[PDB]
Amino acid sequence: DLTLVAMRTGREISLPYPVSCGLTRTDALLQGTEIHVPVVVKDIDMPQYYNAIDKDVIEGQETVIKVKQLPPAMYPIYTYGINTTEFYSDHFEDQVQVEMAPIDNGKAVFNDARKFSKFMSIMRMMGNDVTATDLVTGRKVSNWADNSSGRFLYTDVKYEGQTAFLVDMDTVKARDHCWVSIVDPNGTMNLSYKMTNFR
Amino acid sequence: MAPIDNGKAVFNDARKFSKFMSIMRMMGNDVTATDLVTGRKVSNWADNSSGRFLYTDVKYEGQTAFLVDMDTVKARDHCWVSIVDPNGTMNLSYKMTNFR
Amino acid sequence: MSSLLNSLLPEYFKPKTNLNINSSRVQYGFNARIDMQYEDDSGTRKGSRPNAFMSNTVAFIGNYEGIIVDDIPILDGLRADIFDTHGDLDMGLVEDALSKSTMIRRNVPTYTAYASELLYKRNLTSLFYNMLRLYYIKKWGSIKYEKDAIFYDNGHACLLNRQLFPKSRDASLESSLSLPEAEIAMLDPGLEFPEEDVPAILWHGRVSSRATCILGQACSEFAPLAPFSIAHYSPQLTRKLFVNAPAGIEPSSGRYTHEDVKDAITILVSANQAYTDFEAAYLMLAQTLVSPVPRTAEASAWFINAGMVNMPTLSCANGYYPALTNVNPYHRLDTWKDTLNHWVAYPDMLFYHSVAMIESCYVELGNVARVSDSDAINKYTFTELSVQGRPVMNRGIIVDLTLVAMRTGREISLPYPVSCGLTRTDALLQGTEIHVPVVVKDIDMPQYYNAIDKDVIEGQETVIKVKQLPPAMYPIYTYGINTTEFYSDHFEDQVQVEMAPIDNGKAVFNDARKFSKFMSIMRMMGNDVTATDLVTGRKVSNWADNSSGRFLYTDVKYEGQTAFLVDMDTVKARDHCWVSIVDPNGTMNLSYKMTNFRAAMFSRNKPLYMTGGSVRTIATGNYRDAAERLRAMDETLRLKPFKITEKLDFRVAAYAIP
Amino acid sequence: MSSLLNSLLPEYFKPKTNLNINSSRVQYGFNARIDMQYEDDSGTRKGSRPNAFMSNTVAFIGNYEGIIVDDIPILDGLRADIFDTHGDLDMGLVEDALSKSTMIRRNVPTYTAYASELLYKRNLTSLFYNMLRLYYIKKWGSIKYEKDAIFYDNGHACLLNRQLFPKSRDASLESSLSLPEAEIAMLDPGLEFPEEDVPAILWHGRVSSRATCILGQACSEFAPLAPFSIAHYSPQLTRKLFVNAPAGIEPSSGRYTHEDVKDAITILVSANQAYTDFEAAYLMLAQTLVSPVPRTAEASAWFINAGMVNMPTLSCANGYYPALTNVNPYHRLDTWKDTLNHWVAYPDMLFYHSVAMIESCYVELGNVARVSDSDAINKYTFTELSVQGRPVMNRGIIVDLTLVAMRTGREISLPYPVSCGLTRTDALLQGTEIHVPVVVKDIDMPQYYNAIDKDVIEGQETVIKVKQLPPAMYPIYTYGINTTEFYSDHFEDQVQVEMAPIDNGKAVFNDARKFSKFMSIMRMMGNDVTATDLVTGRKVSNWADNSSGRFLYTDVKYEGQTAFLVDMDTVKARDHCWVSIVDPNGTMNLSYKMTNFRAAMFSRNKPLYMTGGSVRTIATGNYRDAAERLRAMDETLRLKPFKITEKLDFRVAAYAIP
Secondary structure: OHHHHHHHHOOOEEEOOOOOOOOOOOOHHHHOOOEEEEEEOOOOOOOOOOOEOOOOOOOOOEEEEEEOOOOOOOOOOOOOOOOOOOOOOOOOEEEEEEOOOOOOOOEEEEOOOHHHHHHHHHHHHOOEEOEEEEOOOOOEEEOOOOOOOOOOOHHHHOOOOOOOEEEEOOOOEEOOOOOOOOOOOOOOEEEEEEOOOOO | OOOEOOOEEEEOOHHHHHHHHHHHHHHOEEOEEEEOOOOOEEEOOOOOOOOOOOHHHHOOOOOOOEEEEOOOOEEOOOOOOOOOOOOOOOOOOOOOOOOO | OHHHHHHOOOOOOOOOOEOOOOOOEEEEEEEEEEOOEEEOOOOEEEOOEEEEEEEEEEEOOOOEEEEEEOOOOOOOOOEOOOEOOOOOEOHHHHHHHHHHOOOOOOOHHHHHHHHHHHOOOOEOHHHHHHHHHHHHHHHOOOOEEOOOOEEEEOOOEEEEOOOOOOOOOOEEHHHHOOOOOOEOOEOOOOOOOOOOOOOEEEOOOOOOHHHHHHHHHHHOOEOOOOOOHHHOEEOOOOOEOEEEOOOOOOOOOOOOOHHHHHHHHHHHHHHHOOHHHHHHHHHHHHHHOOEEOOOOHHHHHHHOOOEEEEEEOOEOEOOOOOOOOOOOEOOOOOOOOHHHHHHHHOHHHHHHHHHHHHHHHHHHHHHHOOEOOOOOOOOOOOHHHHEOOOOOOOOOHHHHHHHHHHHHOOOEEEOOOOOOEEOOOOOOOOOOOEEEEEEEOOOOHHHHOOEOOOOOOOOOEEEEEEOOOOOOOOOOOOOOOOOOOOOOOOOEEEEEEEOOOOOOOEEEEOOHHHHHHHHHHHHHHOEEOEEEEOOOOOEEEOOOOOOOOOOOHHHHOOOOOOOEEEEOOOOEEOOOOOOOOOOOOOEEEEEEEEEOOOEEEEOOOOEOOOEEOOOOOOOOOOOOOOOOOOOOOOOOEEEOOOEEOOOOOOOOEOEEOO | OHHHHHHOOOOOOOOEEEOOOOOOEEEEEEEEEEOOEEEOOOOOEEOOEEEEEEEEEEEOEOOEEEEEEOOOOOOEOEEOOOEOOOOOEOOOHHHHHHHOOOOOOOOHHHHHHHHHHHOOOEEOHHHHHHHHHHHHHHHOOOOEEOOOOEEEEOOOEEEEHHHHOOOOOOEEOOOOOOOOOOEEEEOOOOOOOOOOOOOEEEOOOEOOHHHHHHHHHHOOOEOOOOOEOOOOEEOOOOOEEEEEOOEOOOOOOOOOOHHHHHHHHHHHHHHHOOOHHHHHHHHHHHHOOOEEOOOOHHHHHHHOOOEEEEEEOOEEEOOOOHHHOOOOEOOOOOOOOHHHHHHHHOHHHHHHHHHHHHHHHHHHHHHHOOOOOOOOOOOOOOHHHHOOOOOOOOOOHHHHHHHHHHHHOOOOOOOOOOOOEEOOOOHHHHOOOEEEEEEEOOOOOOOOOOEOOOOOOOOOEEEEEEOOOOOOOOOOOOOOOOOOOOOOOOOEEEEEEOOOOOOOOEEEEOOOHHHHHHHHHHHHOOEEOEEEEOOOOOEEEOOOOOOOOOOOHHHHOOOOOOOEEEEOOOOEEOOOOOOOOOOOOOOEEEEEEEEEEEEEEEEOOEEOOOEEEEOOOOOOHHHHHHHHHOOOOOOOEEEOOOOEEOOOOOOOOEEOOO
16 A cells, blocks of 8 residues: 555655555455446446446346456545646646548547547536447447546546547537537637636 | 457558558459448449549548458459568558550 | 577567467468579570478377476575575575564474475476466367378378377367366465475465366366377376465366466466466477477377476475565566566467477487487487586476577577476487388389388388488478578578489489489479489489478488489479479589568468467566676576588588587 | 585585485496507407496495493583683682572572582483484385395395394384383472483473474384384483473474474574584484495405494483573584584485495595504504594594595594594404305305305305405595505506417416406406416406496405416406407507596486485575675665556556656
């Protein structure tokens, strides 16, 4: 636990005695096997999003989700922009440039995985419900997959494969309050934000 | 060359897809790919008269990703250069002489 | 040792990750372009072979037997403090190391006494060997062995799988073995006296239901039905195996996927710090995995008698004393985790490393067999002069790695002098003619082969005599890295020979070297010439091997001195380029160039294509944060190469120190 | 002393830790390449044996009998304060030391009075000796002894195990002894007056359940059934043994392994500070671990009567005076812990140290038996002039160490002049005829051997009269380090036999020296020569051994005038790899050359290989440099970080060191 803190802050932690007592967290990681978490369903269109065991499930049924790679359990908040990585993208200033031509009728394909993550994340700050669909596999991902942080990490796809995300920009829905509207875009889009003060 | 997973190679970029099918045509390999957005089959052997591949043979303005069928690569016209299984970075250098 | 066997592959070839093997036979070669130029007294002629396929054939069939022997301990993974200023294990410091890392100090005198006896016999190489074999049985578990199939087939003679492998039946690879399960018990912490002749191993967290079944079957006896390379007979490793797991082990499931065996190996190595033990097992499997299909019928003499695989005894004392294994392990080389990191990333790459190793051994044994038994370096005393360490016995891997050094001409070095694996030089080290059993296909068989019965009928089972062992394989991957006169595997070469006077329709070739050069030219032009050996009275043919398009002098099948009567009237035209002429006149000059190499693999008379992505390099430098190279070149194994010095005889080979 | 016995081993010999002995007979030796030559007026005939095996057979049987004798006290261990300037117990500082301690005040005056007698009872050599024998009995317990087995056989004469060892039943070494346990009582600290004639020892913490069983059996009578060397007859050391352990003595377990005996020794030496006592016990066992199988039939005279082992009486008064032993002991030599530290690390090395000592002794007693009594340094007075100390009696280890000093040609130094162990020079000093029994095979025996009967039918039990004792072992480990002309153990040697054509093969050797070299070199060449003495009329054969393959002059079995007729048309070729003497004419010149040496061991007519780690030369400095180091790295858990680095893919993470 102390060696993980040393990696986060980026400093040298020193104790007087090399004592080895307390909780061990790295248990499910080192096993390197599939884990079967139980879930009770609410809607009927669940198993498209989550990697479920059943393909058709009536509401109020107890199902199982197959988790292979462990997603992050917490988002950095106290350690925000002290040792920044491009995965979490916990910057004060950030921008993304999605390049579209008028010949394309709103439909954009993200060949790159990095800028797809930043587009889907900044659109959620702006209070827009985007629903992308993978062209190779045929699954779907939604940027609204959290009600705490309000960011989109790439591990919300729940699948490691080839990157071909079709996003249709005439099915974008305004969900939250205090939001900027994308009524009908034409040409190159440039999104950007700035965090100024903290309380 | 894109990684061949089962018997299919995903070409996400547009420029790389144009260069790939342009090489395989000069070697003389009738390759058939599936456009993932539309769901229609493209073929590099569209025009027989002029022995070249233009990107307009896809017949879809806009952005897409192609799933190339690497198992069903037919051998129409074979010179000694002609290979079926590409591996890594493909280099083709040709010279045209003796016009009449 | 990944970096060693990876170097053997040719510079042009870089193989992809996956390879879907779906048969018990794989051809491997290259498609080269030959530009021949002919000149004689009549005039000049220029041609060009546009596509020429030179290939060997390798199979998954080889009769092997396991023996449990006592070998050296691998002292890698133990904490660095117990070792003194030199590279030696001091029992004075083991007492201190165990004392400081406990509150209960009553048990220190007892713990030290048992530890001193067990540390000098620690070896997990035999356990990883069986775990690796279980991985490949599950992965390639759809390969069929038919009993009434062909082994070698030329046209005159034939060998079936009934012969060479009696006591065999028709079975798939998954159907070959029905392994039992050894008792995987839990070591409760509190037991004071380690039970003797039972090893104890560490584990990360809870032992999975699937991990139990793998460890149970890995320790059990292997009893095959069909002869397979990766299912050979092995004795029982242990009866019990303790596992010091804080969380209790689960009962055995019964079934497991090939993916589950990877998870079992990755945990077992990481916990025990047994990285060098894995490197030994990796090299040990590279020898066994594949076996050569013989070039000619005489080259079946190698694979009659069952070669012995020396499996080290399974012992480990990490479970009892987990204080000795800590966060600061002792290692001799800084590149000591490369072999595992290579396998876990690219499992199917072992096939290419195995083909590269067995080729290098069986090519160089072609030369060692021809060495006269009245020189400094001969078949008996070639290993002993080469090695510069202190192993238990010059057996197993030491013999194989000595032949790789002689091939490549570079100094090979391992951290520990391990003597574990297959010994090939058994048929070689005996002054006796070997009786290869064969089947007669054509009535004129006794004229070609040295048969017992001089009159035969199509269908009869006879026996042929082999005195000197011919080469089993031709150089393909190791083509032109160092060229001997025997093989003549040049890129560019100018062959010059003087044609003998054609009296009636026959040309007498009294000299041995001139005869070899003549038939070598006529083969490259593509003329099937047949000559009569005057001493024996048997017919030789340059078209002996179709796969590799070259002529070796061992195709005559007569050690000693002779004169050949070549039939110049009956020169058939099998393959004709524009260079190809039938009537040579005076001094024959042939100058050829080989360009445009490209690797190709065939399986079941169709092209076998490589799948997956491109292999990115994984490799660690000589230093991580180490200041001074403390040489420590006393215990490390070193193998010195020998260079072949050609002499006038041509039939005899001779080695010298470079 | 591990140091002096280590130097006796050859330079080419590189020993390993473990040696898996599974029999009661070992043929230790070396493989050498002999280049023999026979020059003559007609021409030269060259030979070459690439692997020539020169061996000395060593067994685990030998009749010995222990007797309890009075020996000097060993004062190493006691605190350095009580000693004066000269180095003897200054009584007055003892009374001062006891007064300023944690002793009961009413016991001080009565205990101080006894000190004058009890403090000079310090000799634990007998206890350590018995505890070392228990270690090797349980380790090599599976070795067998058959009653009707062949002790010696040379074709003509045979000597069975029934002949030398009557009252002998066939049994395994483990099943030989049935040791009864002596009482191990706890010393009451509040005892009125110390009980002399009852030894009291110290212990660290609690006496374990197994330590009671080991100490109980160590201080008991050895009454064996089979005549084994490490299970010979010993009297009862003591009836009762006190142990000053505040933590109570647990009752006897009954069973124990060989590892538990090492635990018992290491606690006993550390508590009592008795390292010099252990060094004496190590050298004692080195003599009487293995006995040599006789080279010739008439060399069995050494092992007819049982040689007495001198075990010093068990006497220790540390239990009564705990204050006088502390962490600052008095020692003469600085390297006083080296012998124990060597044994704890490498227990099985004692086998090599044992054969080195007996081979050194029995070689020198060979060429000591061939000196006339009328001389300065002779049979009786070779020990007195060599010894420059003050031992009680010239017996035990003093006689064996002085013979080693003569062999190697160096000065052997011990800290205390202790006189305990086996005495070998018994049959020599008697100077009388010895009557060895023999069972005959052929009917023409009594011409060769000096037998009691002149006509004896096959299968009869006869007697041979041995007057002068022949050498029991040939020098092998000490080959060409201190060469004498008797053994003729040179690397290069030649002999010139001068004959004229007028003589029809018959040569008479007037000289005795060159007759020995001719007969010896002819046996290397594999030729069976049979000479006949002209004066007496007896016969000698060069083939009188199947181990070394040399001819010593003591094989004549008679001292007289030298006139040996050898007929050189009755020479028969016996062995393989031999040069032929078909028909010689003129002067003969024989010669050989030994070039290289490789250590080899045989057991049950199979190769015995050394396994385990590489044995080093342990020095006092190699451990105490790690004490100087102390691991001075302040024991503070400093965790260093890793900065994550992003690259093209971004899906997978990569950590850097800085």
